[PDB]
Design a protein around this ligand. Structure first.
Ligand code: FE
Ligand code: FE
Length: 219
């Protein structure tokens, strides 16, 4: 019956379900309202297998369940756990990609364009996180979340843009899989990319699937 539940709710209730969905390239973050059934069908996946994997994960509860946590605590968590980390992650990745694209320019597997797309993502996240921290999050903390349809819709649109950039970054890097000739810096950079993707999806998931709907509902 997991297939009839939304991707977002599964990711938020089952430990490491997020990483399972990442493995299947299912967008539980911006597309978290869609059922696992619909997502698995769009990708021609055996949904029974996925339900078995989720059942194994669900043997234990999620260590921290944010679905019912105070919105102020969710906001403060987002800022430290995700916003502050993205601010450090992206500059480092941009410099690594520049070095990789230069040093391995001749090699056929080099992820040409990676720096460009990381820079685009960094520019988007920088302004985006500033708008949330300076406009939307204070509004929610003040209790005006029920009036935030406009601002939230803008943020969710920017989340979609970030999702599109993540898709290009994954394609450019053969789904963040380095070639055999990959140097240490190359492999380390891909590990950092996967960490960024993991974090940004959980980050967007927490906003799209918990903070924003609960704020709009007046919680
Ligand atoms: Fe955010
Ligand atoms: Fe956001």
């Amino acid at each position: 019956a997991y297939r009839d539940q939304p991707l977002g709710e599964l990711a938020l209730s089952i430990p490491r379900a997020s990483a399972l969905f990442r493995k299947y390239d299912m967008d539980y973050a911006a597309g978290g309202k869609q059922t696992l059934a619909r997502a698995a069908a769009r990708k021609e996946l055996d949904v029974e297998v996925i339900e078995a994997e989720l059942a194994k994960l669900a043997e234990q509860p999620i260590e921290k369940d944010w679905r019912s946590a105070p919105l102020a605590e969710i906001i403060d968590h987002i800022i430290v756990r995700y916003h502050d980390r993205h601010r450090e992650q992206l500059p480092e990745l941009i410099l690594q990609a520049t070095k990789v694209e230069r040093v391995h320019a001749d090699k056929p597997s080099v992820p040409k364009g990676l720096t460009k797309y990381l820079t685009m993502l960094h520019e988007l996240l920088s302004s985006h996180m500033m708008k949330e921290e300076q406009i939307l999050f204070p509004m929610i903390k003040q209790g005006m979340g029920s009036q935030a349809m406009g601002p939230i819709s803008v943020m969710e649109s920017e989340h979609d843009e970030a999702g599109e950039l993540l898709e290009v970054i994954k394609h450019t890097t053969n789904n963040v899989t380095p070639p055999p000739e990959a140097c240490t810096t190359w492999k380390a950079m891909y590990n950092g990319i996967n960490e960024l993707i993991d974090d940004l999806m959980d980050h967007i998931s927490l906003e799209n699937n918990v903070l924003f709907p609960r704020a709009l509902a007046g919680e």
